[PDB]
Protein backbone atom coordinates (compact mmCIF):
# COMPACT_ATOMS: atom_id res chain seq x y z
CA UNK A 1 0.00 0.00 0.00
CA UNK A 2 3.06 2.22 -0.29
CA UNK A 3 2.65 4.90 -2.93
CA UNK A 4 5.01 4.65 -5.87
CA UNK A 5 7.73 7.24 -6.24
CA UNK A 6 7.02 9.52 -9.17
CA UNK A 7 10.09 10.63 -11.09
CA UNK A 8 9.70 14.02 -12.72
CA UNK A 9 12.00 15.68 -15.24
CA UNK A 10 12.28 19.46 -15.29
CA UNK A 11 14.15 20.85 -18.29
CA UNK A 12 14.95 24.56 -18.50
CA UNK A 13 15.98 25.61 -22.00
CA UNK A 14 18.11 28.73 -21.72
CA UNK A 15 21.22 30.33 -23.18
CA UNK A 16 21.74 31.97 -19.77
CA UNK A 17 22.21 35.40 -21.33
CA UNK A 18 18.88 37.03 -20.51
CA UNK A 19 17.83 36.27 -16.94
CA UNK A 20 21.17 36.48 -15.13
CA UNK A 21 20.03 35.65 -11.62
CA UNK A 22 16.45 34.36 -11.22
CA UNK A 23 17.48 31.59 -13.65
CA UNK A 24 15.70 29.14 -11.35
CA UNK A 25 12.32 30.88 -10.96
CA UNK A 26 10.45 28.86 -13.59
CA UNK A 27 11.87 25.57 -12.37
CA UNK A 28 11.02 26.45 -8.77
CA UNK A 29 7.43 27.22 -9.77
CA UNK A 30 7.19 23.86 -11.53
CA UNK A 31 8.40 21.90 -8.49
CA UNK A 32 6.16 23.87 -6.11
CA UNK A 33 3.02 23.18 -8.15
CA UNK A 34 3.67 19.51 -8.82
CA UNK A 35 4.58 19.02 -5.14
CA UNK A 36 1.16 20.36 -4.13
CA UNK A 37 -0.70 18.31 -6.75
CA UNK A 38 0.75 14.89 -5.89
CA UNK A 39 0.72 12.83 -2.70
CA UNK A 40 3.47 10.51 -3.96
CA UNK A 41 7.06 10.75 -2.85
CA UNK A 42 8.57 12.83 -5.63
CA UNK A 43 12.04 12.88 -7.14
CA UNK A 44 12.84 15.80 -9.41
CA UNK A 45 15.44 15.65 -12.17
CA UNK A 46 16.31 19.23 -13.06
CA UNK A 47 18.65 20.39 -15.82
CA UNK A 48 19.44 23.69 -17.50
CA UNK A 49 20.18 23.18 -21.18
CA UNK A 50 21.27 25.63 -23.89
CA UNK A 51 18.93 26.42 -26.80
CA UNK A 52 20.63 23.78 -28.95
CA UNK A 53 18.32 21.18 -30.45
CA UNK A 54 20.53 18.11 -30.05
CA UNK A 55 21.34 19.01 -26.44
CA UNK A 56 17.66 19.34 -25.58
CA UNK A 57 16.89 16.03 -27.31
CA UNK A 58 19.68 14.30 -25.40
CA UNK A 59 18.44 15.74 -22.10
CA UNK A 60 14.84 14.71 -22.73
CA UNK A 61 16.00 11.24 -23.74
CA UNK A 62 18.12 10.92 -20.58
CA UNK A 63 15.23 11.98 -18.33
CA UNK A 64 12.85 9.47 -19.94
CA UNK A 65 15.23 6.57 -20.54
CA UNK A 66 17.86 6.76 -17.79
CA UNK A 67 16.06 8.60 -14.98
CA UNK A 68 12.79 6.80 -15.83
CA UNK A 69 10.68 9.95 -15.43
CA UNK A 70 6.93 9.36 -15.71
CA UNK A 71 6.51 13.05 -16.48
CA UNK A 72 8.98 15.42 -18.11
CA UNK A 73 8.20 19.11 -18.44
CA UNK A 74 10.13 21.83 -20.22
CA UNK A 75 10.17 25.58 -19.75
CA UNK A 76 11.36 28.12 -22.30
CA UNK A 77 11.95 28.28 -26.04
CA UNK A 78 8.47 27.66 -27.44
CA UNK A 79 7.61 30.77 -29.48
CA UNK A 80 8.12 31.75 -33.14
CA UNK A 81 11.66 33.07 -32.62
CA UNK A 82 14.75 31.54 -34.22
CA UNK A 83 16.24 29.81 -31.18
CA UNK A 84 12.90 28.60 -29.80
CA UNK A 85 13.60 24.96 -30.67
CA UNK A 86 12.11 23.14 -27.67
CA UNK A 87 8.97 21.90 -29.47
CA UNK A 88 11.08 20.57 -32.38
CA UNK A 89 13.29 18.65 -29.96
CA UNK A 90 10.21 17.35 -28.17
CA UNK A 91 8.66 16.11 -31.41
CA UNK A 92 11.90 14.40 -32.39
CA UNK A 93 12.15 12.27 -29.23
CA UNK A 94 8.44 11.42 -28.90
CA UNK A 95 6.80 8.51 -30.71
CA UNK A 96 3.23 9.90 -30.48
CA UNK A 97 2.22 13.55 -30.13
CA UNK A 98 -0.88 14.66 -28.22
CA UNK A 99 -2.27 17.71 -30.06
CA UNK A 100 -4.99 18.11 -27.40
CA UNK A 101 -2.44 19.41 -24.91
CA UNK A 102 -1.18 22.07 -27.30
CA UNK A 103 -4.75 23.09 -28.04
CA UNK A 104 -5.75 23.42 -24.40
CA UNK A 105 -2.59 25.24 -23.32
CA UNK A 106 -3.18 27.88 -26.02
CA UNK A 107 -6.90 28.17 -25.17
CA UNK A 108 -5.99 28.63 -21.51
CA UNK A 109 -3.48 31.37 -22.29
CA UNK A 110 -5.77 32.91 -24.92
CA UNK A 111 -8.13 33.93 -22.13
CA UNK A 112 -5.45 36.42 -21.08
CA UNK A 113 -3.29 37.35 -24.08
CA UNK A 114 -4.07 37.44 -27.84
CA UNK A 115 -0.48 36.44 -28.59
CA UNK A 116 -1.20 33.06 -27.00
CA UNK A 117 -1.66 31.73 -30.56
CA UNK A 118 2.06 32.22 -31.19
CA UNK A 119 2.93 29.39 -28.81
CA UNK A 120 4.22 26.09 -30.17
CA UNK A 121 4.10 24.31 -26.77
CA UNK A 122 3.21 20.67 -27.31
CA UNK A 123 3.09 17.30 -25.59
CA UNK A 124 3.88 13.74 -26.56
CA UNK A 125 4.73 10.23 -25.44
CA UNK A 126 8.16 8.61 -25.28
CA UNK A 127 7.74 5.03 -24.09
CA UNK A 128 6.42 5.24 -20.52
CA UNK A 129 6.99 9.01 -20.29
CA UNK A 130 4.73 11.98 -20.91
CA UNK A 131 6.56 15.11 -22.08
CA UNK A 132 4.86 18.51 -21.93
CA UNK A 133 6.22 21.94 -22.90
CA UNK A 134 5.25 24.56 -20.28
CA UNK A 135 5.44 28.39 -20.44
CA UNK A 136 8.34 30.48 -19.18
CA UNK A 137 6.81 32.65 -16.46
CA UNK A 138 5.84 31.27 -13.01
CA UNK A 139 2.29 32.70 -13.18
CA UNK A 140 1.81 31.26 -16.68
CA UNK A 141 3.25 27.92 -15.56
CA UNK A 142 0.73 27.70 -12.71
CA UNK A 143 -2.27 28.47 -14.92
CA UNK A 144 -1.03 26.00 -17.53
CA UNK A 145 -0.48 23.14 -15.07
CA UNK A 146 -3.84 23.80 -13.41
CA UNK A 147 -5.46 23.39 -16.82
CA UNK A 148 -3.67 20.29 -18.08
CA UNK A 149 -2.86 18.30 -14.94
CA UNK A 150 -6.36 16.78 -14.52
CA UNK A 151 -5.60 14.64 -17.61
CA UNK A 152 -2.05 13.68 -16.63
CA UNK A 153 -2.41 10.83 -14.10
CA UNK A 154 -4.69 8.86 -16.43
CA UNK A 155 -2.33 9.54 -19.34
CA UNK A 156 0.60 8.24 -17.30
CA UNK A 157 -1.50 5.15 -16.39
CA UNK A 158 -2.22 4.42 -20.06
CA UNK A 159 1.45 4.58 -21.09
CA UNK A 160 2.29 2.28 -18.15
CA UNK A 161 4.11 4.83 -15.99
CA UNK A 162 3.88 4.84 -12.19
CA UNK A 163 0.59 5.51 -10.44
CA UNK A 164 0.08 9.15 -9.48
CA UNK A 165 -2.03 9.79 -6.41
CA UNK A 166 -3.63 13.22 -6.54
CA UNK A 167 -3.86 15.70 -3.69
CA UNK A 168 -7.54 16.43 -4.18
CA UNK A 169 -7.31 19.38 -1.81
CA UNK A 170 -5.39 21.12 -4.60
CA UNK A 171 -6.44 19.59 -7.93
CA UNK A 172 -8.88 17.05 -9.38
CA UNK A 173 -7.78 14.24 -11.68
CA UNK A 174 -10.17 12.11 -13.67
CA UNK A 175 -9.68 8.38 -14.19
CA UNK A 176 -12.26 6.62 -16.41
CA UNK A 177 -13.42 3.37 -14.79
CA UNK A 178 -14.33 -0.04 -16.26
CA UNK B 1 -34.50 12.24 -59.00
CA UNK B 2 -33.29 9.05 -57.32
CA UNK B 3 -31.01 9.49 -54.32
CA UNK B 4 -27.51 8.05 -54.70
CA UNK B 5 -26.51 5.10 -52.55
CA UNK B 6 -24.00 6.14 -49.92
CA UNK B 7 -21.34 3.55 -49.09
CA UNK B 8 -20.11 3.82 -45.52
CA UNK B 9 -17.17 1.94 -44.05
CA UNK B 10 -17.20 1.06 -40.37
CA UNK B 11 -13.86 -0.17 -39.04
CA UNK B 12 -13.73 -1.43 -35.46
CA UNK B 13 -10.15 -1.69 -34.18
CA UNK B 14 -9.86 -4.31 -31.43
CA UNK B 15 -15.22 -11.67 -28.80
CA UNK B 16 -17.29 -11.83 -25.60
CA UNK B 17 -18.54 -8.30 -26.16
CA UNK B 18 -21.38 -6.72 -28.11
CA UNK B 19 -20.08 -4.18 -30.64
CA UNK B 20 -22.24 -1.42 -29.19
CA UNK B 21 -19.92 1.05 -30.94
CA UNK B 22 -20.43 -0.37 -34.43
CA UNK B 23 -24.19 -0.48 -33.88
CA UNK B 24 -24.23 3.09 -32.56
CA UNK B 25 -22.42 4.28 -35.67
CA UNK B 26 -24.87 2.66 -38.08
CA UNK B 27 -27.85 3.82 -35.98
CA UNK B 28 -26.74 7.46 -35.93
CA UNK B 29 -25.76 7.62 -39.59
CA UNK B 30 -29.09 6.06 -40.58
CA UNK B 31 -30.87 8.84 -38.67
CA UNK B 32 -28.78 11.55 -40.34
CA UNK B 33 -29.11 10.45 -43.96
CA UNK B 34 -32.10 9.99 -46.26
CA UNK B 35 -30.05 8.10 -48.88
CA UNK B 36 -30.10 4.33 -49.32
CA UNK B 37 -27.07 3.26 -47.23
CA UNK B 38 -24.72 0.30 -47.61
CA UNK B 39 -22.52 -0.36 -44.61
CA UNK B 40 -19.21 -2.15 -45.00
CA UNK B 41 -18.43 -3.27 -41.47
CA UNK B 42 -15.16 -4.93 -40.47
CA UNK B 43 -13.46 -5.88 -37.22
CA UNK B 44 -9.67 -5.57 -37.39
CA UNK B 45 -6.88 -6.28 -34.89
CA UNK B 46 -4.78 -3.43 -33.48
CA UNK B 47 -1.99 -3.78 -36.03
CA UNK B 48 -1.07 -0.75 -38.11
CA UNK B 49 -0.55 -2.56 -41.42
CA UNK B 50 -3.86 -4.42 -40.97
CA UNK B 51 -5.84 -1.25 -40.24
CA UNK B 52 -4.15 0.44 -43.21
CA UNK B 53 -5.11 -2.53 -45.39
CA UNK B 54 -8.73 -2.40 -44.24
CA UNK B 55 -9.01 1.36 -44.74
CA UNK B 56 -7.52 1.02 -48.22
CA UNK B 57 -10.03 -1.71 -49.11
CA UNK B 58 -13.03 0.30 -47.88
CA UNK B 59 -12.03 3.41 -49.84
CA UNK B 60 -10.61 1.85 -53.00
CA UNK B 61 -12.60 -1.34 -53.55
CA UNK B 62 -15.87 -0.71 -51.70
CA UNK B 63 -15.82 2.93 -52.84
CA UNK B 64 -16.94 4.24 -49.45
CA UNK B 65 -17.78 7.96 -49.40
CA UNK B 66 -17.31 8.02 -45.64
CA UNK B 67 -15.17 5.68 -43.57
CA UNK B 68 -15.30 5.80 -39.79
CA UNK B 69 -13.09 3.98 -37.29
CA UNK B 70 -13.70 3.21 -33.67
CA UNK B 71 -11.03 2.31 -31.15
CA UNK B 72 -7.28 2.75 -30.66
CA UNK B 73 -6.92 6.53 -30.55
CA UNK B 74 -5.39 7.27 -27.15
CA UNK B 75 -1.81 7.61 -25.84
CA UNK B 76 -1.35 3.87 -25.19
CA UNK B 77 1.22 1.81 -27.09
CA UNK B 78 -1.16 -0.29 -29.20
CA UNK B 79 -3.39 2.66 -30.10
CA UNK B 80 -2.27 3.06 -33.72
CA UNK B 81 -5.48 3.93 -35.56
CA UNK B 82 -4.47 7.59 -36.13
CA UNK B 83 -1.07 6.47 -37.49
CA UNK B 84 -2.76 4.07 -39.91
CA UNK B 85 -5.17 6.83 -40.92
CA UNK B 86 -2.43 9.37 -41.66
CA UNK B 87 -0.65 6.72 -43.74
CA UNK B 88 -3.52 6.07 -46.15
CA UNK B 89 -4.73 9.69 -46.43
CA UNK B 90 -3.26 12.28 -48.83
CA UNK B 91 -4.55 15.30 -46.89
CA UNK B 92 -5.43 15.56 -43.19
CA UNK B 93 -8.16 17.87 -41.89
CA UNK B 94 -7.02 19.22 -38.51
CA UNK B 95 -10.36 20.96 -37.94
CA UNK B 96 -12.07 17.61 -37.26
CA UNK B 97 -9.56 16.56 -34.62
CA UNK B 98 -9.90 19.95 -32.94
CA UNK B 99 -13.69 19.88 -32.89
CA UNK B 100 -13.93 16.28 -31.70
CA UNK B 101 -11.62 17.04 -28.75
CA UNK B 102 -13.42 20.30 -27.95
CA UNK B 103 -16.69 18.38 -27.97
CA UNK B 104 -15.51 15.68 -25.58
CA UNK B 105 -13.70 18.23 -23.40
CA UNK B 106 -17.13 19.58 -22.43
CA UNK B 107 -17.60 16.47 -20.33
CA UNK B 108 -14.21 14.95 -19.39
CA UNK B 109 -10.75 16.54 -18.94
CA UNK B 110 -9.06 13.46 -20.40
CA UNK B 111 -10.49 14.37 -23.80
CA UNK B 112 -7.16 16.05 -24.60
CA UNK B 113 -5.52 12.63 -24.67
CA UNK B 114 -7.33 11.70 -27.87
CA UNK B 115 -5.43 11.51 -31.17
CA UNK B 116 -8.59 11.06 -33.26
CA UNK B 117 -8.15 12.67 -36.68
CA UNK B 118 -9.73 12.91 -40.12
CA UNK B 119 -8.38 13.02 -43.65
CA UNK B 120 -9.02 12.49 -47.34
CA UNK B 121 -8.13 9.50 -49.49
CA UNK B 122 -9.18 10.19 -53.07
CA UNK B 123 -12.99 10.39 -52.94
CA UNK B 124 -13.29 9.17 -49.34
CA UNK B 125 -13.44 11.00 -46.02
CA UNK B 126 -11.98 8.98 -43.13
CA UNK B 127 -12.82 10.00 -39.56
CA UNK B 128 -11.61 8.47 -36.29
CA UNK B 129 -14.49 8.18 -33.78
CA UNK B 130 -14.55 7.40 -30.02
CA UNK B 131 -15.16 3.96 -28.50
CA UNK B 132 -18.50 4.31 -26.69
CA UNK B 133 -22.06 4.77 -28.06
CA UNK B 134 -22.71 7.98 -26.08
CA UNK B 135 -19.45 9.64 -27.12
CA UNK B 136 -19.91 8.42 -30.70
CA UNK B 137 -23.29 10.14 -30.98
CA UNK B 138 -21.91 13.32 -29.40
CA UNK B 139 -18.98 13.13 -31.80
CA UNK B 140 -21.06 12.60 -34.94
CA UNK B 141 -23.54 15.25 -33.83
CA UNK B 142 -20.67 17.74 -33.78
CA UNK B 143 -18.88 16.84 -37.01
CA UNK B 144 -21.63 15.54 -39.30
CA UNK B 145 -22.94 18.97 -40.36
CA UNK B 146 -19.70 19.50 -42.32
CA UNK B 147 -19.52 16.02 -43.86
CA UNK B 148 -21.89 16.19 -46.88
CA UNK B 149 -20.17 19.28 -48.30
CA UNK B 150 -16.76 17.70 -47.66
CA UNK B 151 -17.85 14.60 -49.57
CA UNK B 152 -19.13 16.89 -52.35
CA UNK B 153 -15.74 18.59 -52.66
CA UNK B 154 -13.75 15.35 -52.88
CA UNK B 155 -16.23 14.17 -55.55
CA UNK B 156 -17.96 11.49 -53.46
CA UNK B 157 -21.68 10.72 -53.80
CA UNK B 158 -24.32 13.25 -52.85
CA UNK B 159 -25.59 12.87 -49.28
CA UNK B 160 -29.15 13.98 -48.59
CA UNK B 161 -29.46 14.99 -44.95
CA UNK B 162 -32.41 14.14 -42.71
CA UNK B 163 -32.93 17.68 -41.44
CA UNK B 164 -35.29 16.49 -38.73
CA UNK B 165 -32.29 14.94 -36.99
CA UNK B 166 -29.22 16.98 -37.94
CA UNK B 167 -28.55 20.33 -39.60
CA UNK B 168 -28.03 20.41 -43.34
CA UNK B 169 -25.48 22.94 -44.55
CA UNK B 170 -23.88 23.52 -47.92
CA UNK B 171 -22.40 26.99 -48.55
CA UNK B 172 -23.28 29.27 -51.46
CA UNK B 173 -21.70 27.98 -54.67
CA UNK C 1 11.59 59.11 -36.11
CA UNK C 2 9.65 57.89 -39.12
CA UNK C 3 8.02 54.51 -39.48
CA UNK C 4 9.66 51.53 -41.14
CA UNK C 5 8.14 50.46 -44.44
CA UNK C 6 6.25 47.19 -44.05
CA UNK C 7 6.56 44.88 -47.04
CA UNK C 8 3.57 42.61 -47.59
CA UNK C 9 3.30 39.66 -49.94
CA UNK C 10 -0.05 38.70 -51.44
CA UNK C 11 -0.24 35.42 -53.33
CA UNK C 12 -3.41 34.40 -55.13
CA UNK C 13 -3.83 30.73 -56.03
CA UNK C 14 -6.13 30.62 -59.05
CA UNK C 15 -6.75 27.74 -61.50
CA UNK C 16 -6.88 30.35 -64.31
CA UNK C 17 -10.57 31.16 -64.92
CA UNK C 18 -13.56 30.25 -62.77
CA UNK C 19 -13.73 33.77 -61.37
CA UNK C 20 -14.03 35.53 -64.73
CA UNK C 21 -13.49 39.29 -64.51
CA UNK C 22 -13.46 39.11 -60.70
CA UNK C 23 -9.81 37.98 -60.90
CA UNK C 24 -8.56 40.62 -58.46
CA UNK C 25 -11.16 41.00 -55.69
CA UNK C 26 -9.41 39.03 -52.93
CA UNK C 27 -6.05 40.81 -53.09
CA UNK C 28 -7.73 44.22 -53.02
CA UNK C 29 -9.72 43.25 -49.93
CA UNK C 30 -6.42 42.32 -48.31
CA UNK C 31 -4.82 45.60 -49.41
CA UNK C 32 -7.74 47.62 -48.04
CA UNK C 33 -7.78 45.89 -44.65
CA UNK C 34 -4.05 46.08 -43.98
CA UNK C 35 -3.94 49.72 -45.11
CA UNK C 36 -6.60 50.31 -42.47
CA UNK C 37 -4.83 48.33 -39.74
CA UNK C 38 -1.36 49.79 -40.18
CA UNK C 39 0.02 53.30 -39.90
CA UNK C 40 3.26 52.33 -41.64
CA UNK C 41 3.92 53.09 -45.26
CA UNK C 42 3.25 49.79 -47.03
CA UNK C 43 4.69 48.09 -50.08
CA UNK C 44 2.68 45.17 -51.40
CA UNK C 45 4.16 42.43 -53.56
CA UNK C 46 1.34 40.75 -55.47
CA UNK C 47 1.39 37.66 -57.65
CA UNK C 48 -1.15 35.30 -59.18
CA UNK C 49 0.10 31.76 -59.68
CA UNK C 50 -1.45 28.59 -61.07
CA UNK C 51 -2.57 25.90 -58.62
CA UNK C 52 0.77 24.09 -58.88
CA UNK C 53 2.58 23.34 -55.63
CA UNK C 54 6.10 24.05 -56.91
CA UNK C 55 5.11 27.43 -58.40
CA UNK C 56 3.44 28.52 -55.16
CA UNK C 57 6.48 27.38 -53.19
CA UNK C 58 8.79 29.40 -55.46
CA UNK C 59 6.52 32.44 -55.19
CA UNK C 60 6.39 32.35 -51.38
CA UNK C 61 10.16 31.94 -51.31
CA UNK C 62 10.58 34.93 -53.64
CA UNK C 63 8.36 37.15 -51.47
CA UNK C 64 10.21 36.20 -48.28
CA UNK C 65 13.80 35.97 -49.53
CA UNK C 66 13.95 38.63 -52.25
CA UNK C 67 11.15 41.11 -51.58
CA UNK C 68 11.91 40.72 -47.86
CA UNK C 69 8.24 40.64 -46.87
CA UNK C 70 7.44 40.90 -43.17
CA UNK C 71 4.00 39.43 -43.76
CA UNK C 72 3.07 37.09 -46.60
CA UNK C 73 -0.57 36.12 -47.09
CA UNK C 74 -2.15 33.67 -49.52
CA UNK C 75 -5.74 33.43 -50.68
CA UNK C 76 -7.65 30.38 -51.92
CA UNK C 77 -6.89 26.68 -52.28
CA UNK C 78 -6.99 25.52 -48.67
CA UNK C 79 -9.95 23.12 -48.60
CA UNK C 80 -10.34 19.35 -48.98
CA UNK C 81 -10.56 19.38 -52.80
CA UNK C 82 -7.77 17.72 -54.77
CA UNK C 83 -6.16 20.82 -56.29
CA UNK C 84 -6.20 22.76 -53.00
CA UNK C 85 -2.45 22.55 -52.36
CA UNK C 86 -1.68 25.96 -50.84
CA UNK C 87 -1.22 24.65 -47.28
CA UNK C 88 1.19 21.95 -48.51
CA UNK C 89 3.30 24.55 -50.29
CA UNK C 90 3.18 26.75 -47.21
CA UNK C 91 4.40 23.99 -44.92
CA UNK C 92 7.25 23.18 -47.28
CA UNK C 93 8.73 26.68 -47.26
CA UNK C 94 8.24 27.41 -43.55
CA UNK C 95 10.75 26.39 -40.86
CA UNK C 96 8.31 26.52 -37.93
CA UNK C 97 4.54 26.19 -38.18
CA UNK C 98 2.19 28.05 -35.82
CA UNK C 99 -0.84 25.81 -35.16
CA UNK C 100 -2.47 28.52 -33.02
CA UNK C 101 -3.26 30.57 -36.13
CA UNK C 102 -5.01 27.68 -37.87
CA UNK C 103 -7.01 26.94 -34.74
CA UNK C 104 -8.14 30.55 -34.37
CA UNK C 105 -9.03 30.98 -38.05
CA UNK C 106 -11.18 27.85 -37.95
CA UNK C 107 -12.87 28.82 -34.66
CA UNK C 108 -13.65 32.29 -36.00
CA UNK C 109 -15.30 30.90 -39.13
CA UNK C 110 -17.08 28.18 -37.13
CA UNK C 111 -19.22 30.81 -35.40
CA UNK C 112 -20.64 31.37 -38.88
CA UNK C 113 -20.55 28.10 -40.83
CA UNK C 114 -20.22 24.42 -39.76
CA UNK C 115 -17.97 23.74 -42.75
CA UNK C 116 -15.24 25.87 -41.17
CA UNK C 117 -13.65 22.65 -39.92
CA UNK C 118 -12.90 21.65 -43.51
CA UNK C 119 -10.29 24.40 -43.84
CA UNK C 120 -6.58 23.57 -43.85
CA UNK C 121 -5.50 27.22 -43.56
CA UNK C 122 -2.22 27.50 -41.66
CA UNK C 123 0.53 29.90 -40.65
CA UNK C 124 4.26 29.59 -40.21
CA UNK C 125 7.65 31.28 -40.11
CA UNK C 126 10.28 31.51 -42.83
CA UNK C 127 13.27 33.45 -41.53
CA UNK C 128 11.99 36.99 -40.90
CA UNK C 129 8.64 36.40 -42.61
CA UNK C 130 5.26 35.38 -41.20
CA UNK C 131 3.19 33.45 -43.77
CA UNK C 132 -0.56 33.02 -43.30
CA UNK C 133 -3.18 31.31 -45.45
CA UNK C 134 -6.33 33.44 -45.71
CA UNK C 135 -9.81 32.61 -47.08
CA UNK C 136 -10.84 33.17 -50.69
CA UNK C 137 -13.66 35.70 -50.47
CA UNK C 138 -13.51 39.39 -49.36
CA UNK C 139 -16.05 38.99 -46.52
CA UNK C 140 -14.29 35.96 -45.03
CA UNK C 141 -10.92 37.65 -45.52
CA UNK C 142 -11.92 40.69 -43.45
CA UNK C 143 -13.33 38.48 -40.68
CA UNK C 144 -10.17 36.38 -40.71
CA UNK C 145 -7.73 39.29 -40.58
CA UNK C 146 -9.79 40.96 -37.86
CA UNK C 147 -9.34 37.87 -35.70
CA UNK C 148 -5.65 37.12 -36.26
CA UNK C 149 -4.09 40.54 -36.74
CA UNK C 150 -3.84 41.42 -33.03
CA UNK C 151 -1.13 38.74 -32.72
CA UNK C 152 0.74 39.68 -35.89
CA UNK C 153 2.83 42.77 -35.01
CA UNK C 154 4.31 40.97 -32.00
CA UNK C 155 5.00 37.83 -34.02
CA UNK C 156 6.78 39.91 -36.63
CA UNK C 157 8.81 41.56 -33.84
CA UNK C 158 9.89 38.16 -32.52
CA UNK C 159 11.10 36.91 -35.89
CA UNK C 160 13.01 40.18 -36.35
CA UNK C 161 10.79 41.63 -39.08
CA UNK C 162 10.07 45.35 -39.38
CA UNK C 163 8.15 47.16 -36.65
CA UNK C 164 4.42 47.44 -37.34
CA UNK C 165 2.70 50.53 -35.96
CA UNK C 166 -0.97 49.70 -35.50
CA UNK C 167 -3.84 52.06 -36.28
CA UNK C 168 -5.51 51.70 -32.90
CA UNK C 169 -8.65 53.36 -34.24
CA UNK C 170 -9.35 50.30 -36.38
CA UNK C 171 -7.69 47.35 -34.66
CA UNK C 172 -5.86 46.63 -31.40
CA UNK C 173 -2.58 44.73 -31.35
CA UNK C 174 -0.95 43.30 -28.25
CA UNK C 175 2.73 43.57 -27.38
CA UNK C 176 3.40 42.05 -23.93
CA UNK C 177 5.40 43.85 -21.23
> Mind giving me the DSSP string for A66-128?
IS--SEEEEES--SSSTT--HHHHHHHH-SEE-HHHHHHHHHHHHTT-GGGGG----EEEETT
The answer to whether the CB of B129 falls within 8 A of the CB of B68 is yes
Give the CATH number for residue A176.
Answer: 3.40.980.10
CA-nearest of C43, C44, C46, C57 to C12 is: C46
CA-nearest of B112, B108, C100, C118 to A97 is: B112
The answer to whether the CB of C70 falls within 8 A of the CB of C128 is yes
Chain C's closest residue to A115, CA to CA, is C151
The answer to whether the CB of B40 falls within 8 A of the CB of B7 is yes
Domain count, chain C: 1
Half-sphere exposure of residue C92: CA atoms within 13 angstroms, side-chain side: 14
C contact test, residue of B32, B65, B89, B94 with most C CBs within 10 A: B94
Task: Report the C-alpha gap between B127 and A61 in whole angstroms.
Answer: 33
In our burial notation (b when 16+ CB lie closer than 10 A, e otherwise), range B108-121 reads: ebbbbbbbbbbbbb
- Contact list in C for residue B94 (CB cut-off 8 A) is 99, 102, 106, 120
Residue C140: count other Cβ atoms within 10 Å of its Cβ.
21
- Contact list in A for residue B110 (CB cut-off 8 A) is 150-151, 154-155, 174, 176
To the nearest whole angstrom, how far is the Cα of A79 from the nearest Cα of chain C? 8
A contact test, residue of C70, C95, C98, C99 with most A CBs within 10 A: C99
CA-nearest of A13, A17, A97 to A57 is: A13
Chain C's closest residue to B147, CA to CA, is C115
Task: Report the C-alpha gap between C158 and A138 in whole angstroms.
Answer: 21
- Contact list in C for residue B99 (CB cut-off 8 A) is 110, 117
Structural biology method used: X-ray
DSSP tally for chain A: helices H, then strands E: 6, 6
* Residue C141 structural domain: 1-177
Half-sphere exposure of residue A11: CA atoms within 13 angstroms, side-chain side: 33
Task: Report the C-alpha gap between A60 and A47 in whole angstroms.
Answer: 10
To the nearest whole angstrom, how far is the Cα of C87 from the nearest Cα of chain B? 10
CA-nearest of C108, C142, C111 to C26 is: C142
Q: Tell me if C117 and B125 make a contact (CB, 8 A cut-off).
A: no
Q: How far apart are the first and last CA of chain A?
A: 22
Chain B's closest residue to A161, CA to CA, is B76
The answer to whether the CB of A6 falls within 8 A of the CB of A43 is yes
The answer to whether the CB of C27 falls within 8 A of the CB of C63 is no
Indicate the SS3 state at residue B79.
Answer: coil
Interface A–C counts its CB contacts (< 8 A) at: 54
In our burial notation (b when 16+ CB lie closer than 10 A, e otherwise), range C76-109 reads: bbbbbbeebbbbbbbeebbebbbbbbbbbbbbbb
CA-nearest of C94, C3, C85, C22 to C49 is: C85
Count the residues in chain A.
178
CB burial of residue A82 (10 Å; 0-12, 13-18, 19+): middle
- Contact list in C for residue A119 (CB cut-off 8 A) is 100
Resolution (A): 1.8
Amino acid sequence: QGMQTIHIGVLSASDRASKGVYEDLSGKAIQEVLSEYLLNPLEFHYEIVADERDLIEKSLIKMCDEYQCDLVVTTGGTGPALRDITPEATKKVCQKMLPGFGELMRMTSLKYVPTAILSRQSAGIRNKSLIINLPGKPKSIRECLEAVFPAIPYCVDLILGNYMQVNEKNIQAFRPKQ
